[PDB]
Amino acid sequence: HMTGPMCLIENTNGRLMANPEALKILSAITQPMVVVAIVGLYRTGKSYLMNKLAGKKKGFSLGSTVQSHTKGIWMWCVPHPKKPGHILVLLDTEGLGDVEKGDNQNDSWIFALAVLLSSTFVYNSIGTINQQAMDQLYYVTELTHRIRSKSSPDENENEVEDSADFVSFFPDFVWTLRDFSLDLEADGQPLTPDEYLTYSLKLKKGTSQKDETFNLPRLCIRKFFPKKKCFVFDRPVHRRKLAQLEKLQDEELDPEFVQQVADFCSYIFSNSKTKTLSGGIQVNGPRLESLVLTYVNAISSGDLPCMENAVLALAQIENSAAVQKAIAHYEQQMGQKVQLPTETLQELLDLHRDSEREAIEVFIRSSFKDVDHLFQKELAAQLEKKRDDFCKQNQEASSDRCSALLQVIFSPLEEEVKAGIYSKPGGYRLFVQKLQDLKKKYYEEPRKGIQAEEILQTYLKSKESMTDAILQTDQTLT
Amino acid sequence: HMTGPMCLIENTNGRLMANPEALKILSAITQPMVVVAIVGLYRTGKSYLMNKLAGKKKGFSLGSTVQSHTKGIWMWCVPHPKKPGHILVLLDTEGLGDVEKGDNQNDSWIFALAVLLSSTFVYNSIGTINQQAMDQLYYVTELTHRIRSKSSPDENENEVEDSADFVSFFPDFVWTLRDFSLDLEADGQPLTPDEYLTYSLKLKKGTSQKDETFNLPRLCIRKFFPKKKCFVFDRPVHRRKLAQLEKLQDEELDPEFVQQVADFCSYIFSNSKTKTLSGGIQVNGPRLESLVLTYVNAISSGDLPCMENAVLALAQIENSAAVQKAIAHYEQQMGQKVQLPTETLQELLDLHRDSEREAIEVFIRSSFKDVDHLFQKELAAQLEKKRDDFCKQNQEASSDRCSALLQVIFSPLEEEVKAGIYSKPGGYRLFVQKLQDLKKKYYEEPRKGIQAEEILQTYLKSKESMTDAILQTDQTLT
Ligand SMILES: Nc1nc2c(ncn2[C@@H]2O[C@H](COP(=O)(O)OP(=O)(O)O)[C@@H](O)[C@H]2O)c(=O)[nH]1
Ligand SMILES: Nc1nc2c(ncn2[C@@H]2O[C@H](COP(=O)(O)OP(=O)(O)O)[C@@H](O)[C@H]2O)c(=O)[nH]1
Ligand SMILES: [Mg+2]
């Protein structure tokens, strides 16, 4: 069928575009297919391994430098050696964690494309199964949910997971270990690699919070991948004659490594299912063409936002949580330590000043290293907005306080006497002595509120109709 | 001097506690110390290489199973082989990436402790310089800065970095690569180990946004680590006769590994400096035990705001960014769809409910897989608080607007009634219908606000002063 593999999706400066020359060939296949992807760290031998999957010497380019060689996703359509009527599709993948590119965002995109387009997903790692490998694999599986949610109608996304024959939809999982050298023992009893992986995904007793954080990744991985597997391979050669592996035959390699490669290939051939979409329809060439088009567009067409390409970004989100905590801490000392109404504007100035000389250092204690004090000035703006909100709350609370104090000391001594008492010949002469020598003098009771001083002026501007009015001229009549 | 190592900080159930048996022997040593600390991926040979630093076969316990063996931090004190009067203190720390333990919180704490206590830091890795290794190393670098901010007074943290002879404070860096297999080549030109390290730490051209994301880890690494070096080591044994390595002489090992380990040991002995605190003070026994104590209490004294366990959870916290996007869309709709003093309150509530439905459909379109709908209910509470904010905004808006209307349609009337032809009997016979005439003409005037009738009622209860006085005056006129 295909003499050589050709690039399916390109990767130029962080963009992903479906390759029309690969789409043209892909559209020409009508049989249902079996797809076998792969992912793994960069310079790990992924291309060398998928050469054995095709079973042909010479294939995906290997390379032997410290630079990454395989870029983008490369397909290779071959007839299935063990299942008649179906076409085996091998996908090669750009290595994870490249230092020359230094971009985790594109890494996760290629990872997600591999798992989504795969009906048999293969992970690659060196030495041991690792917590970092678990976190990266776990993080991808939910990103796969994000991608499908933007291009799939219903029947398997976030509404119905089990009891829908979904075990044929999600890809079967395989974990490969490279250059395994440790003895397969744990707690005393030896372990088969299947038992090793299951122990790595073994749940933890009960339900604490640190136990839930432990259990959460393993549970999600178990749900995502119905069937799981694990393999181990020794070093292909004893010394480092590792640049001539494209030219070396099987006898020069370690016989155990050849046996393990044959076992892995036999497992894949005899247990890989046919890729199917939601609904059980077997996926063929044109279906794959539309699938890769939709997924590539879903990645590079606006939506699907992921900011994995940093650690400072998530640290700054935690720092935003610290802004929330500092706001709570500031509100605690501004609500419980000090009262609701006020005494003087300078008093509130100093009060907010010391509350800030607490909150800012609380921020810096619970914070992270922020660039150019961007988040620091964001907290400053947030605290300024909160200070303005508290000043409005002060101008409202002190307004109510002054109105109520007038209604409780001034009104009960003015309204009850403004009816008939001030009809006497000279009520104003003693009303001034009443007001300006008792009411204003007692108004100096603490918690006046300097923002409510103008309310006194408004009240006087409202009282001019009984200061001199209501016939303050009865002396002339008498 | 010392026959064997001992634990310095025990790590039990994720808790770090200083070991008094180790603090006691620390307290009895007076000579200055050079401290070499190691970290790396778990089950890699950290303990094996630190055995070669002391140059004694059998030492730090190795462990040859797939389970982690070295737990916590283990200290060893020896006389300095090449610096008379100094003492070499080796710190072997628990490896990162444990699957049985499965907690990135504790691994980061152990990492940070090793960096802080080290006068010479050794990062151990497998295969190649790795972007994940840079991502973790960068994350640690900020972590050590923050930890020092909780136990160091001044002169070195966040205020004065350069031009303070700080090159002695921050530890030198050695990146050791294990089981190196690739040829040393890049862009066609061969590379030395240090050239490889600086090429992986080579910054990129100019100023884009992604390029700053690229440059950010490398800038921090090259800043906080003054002197950098890299070393490569081949496989110690051709076959995997690797479980009896502590019983193995140098003859049966590959001579290249012995040569590289000798060069690395020579570099360490001839270039590692005495540990210097802030200000240049050399470290001794009491100072090192004081450092250990204060850093242990710094870690275990409620100063743990930085976490990276379940990185998908932090990617979920980007639903907060989705919340901000929904809030931006909601506020834009309020600014454009509805005018600021909306019609009464029922229309406000209905349009707000429709806009909240639009906001929630935007939220479900953008976000995904809410954990027990926690972010859903937090967005509901945020929009509830925003409804309260728009409610007081409409309250003030109605206050301003109805005040403006009443003043523009009442002030000539209130001026002409204070000084006019209303003193004569029958003058109020025109006002007694005109006040409700004005009220009804306002009622016909649109765009009231929720507090329209209430505000007019307060105006009435504040404006019987210019009714009753002249009402009584009219009685005298009659
Ligand atoms: N560490 C390791 N390297 C291998 C193994 N098998 C082959 N290699 C070498 O790894 C080198 C790079 O692999 P490469 O094809 O670049 O993988 P890719 O970059 O992920 O596509 C090849 O030159 C192989 O010689 C293995 O099992 N372990
Ligand atoms: N991959 C690798 N393993 C080694 C090397 N040297 C020793 N080992 C083995 O790796 C294990 C050492 O792990 P260890 O030193 O305990 O790391 P730790 O488990 O974190 O303390 C032992 O089995 C050693 O025999 C090496 O150069 N490369
Ligand atoms: Mg490749």
Author numbering:
A (entry chain B), B (entry chain A): 6 to 483
Article sentences:
Guanylate-binding proteins (GBPs) are interferon-inducible guanosine triphosphate hydrolases (GTPases) mediating host defense against intracellular pathogens. Their antimicrobial activity hinges on their ability to self-associate and coat pathogen-associated compartments or cytosolic bacteria. GBP1 is a multidomain protein consisting of an N-terminal large GTPase (LG) domain and a C-terminal α-helical region (C-terminal helical domain, CTHD), divided into a middle domain (MD; α7–α11) and an elongated C-terminal GTPase effector domain (GED; α12–α13). In the absence of guanine nucleotides, the GED folds onto the MD and interacts with the LG domain and MD to maintain GBP1 in the resting state.
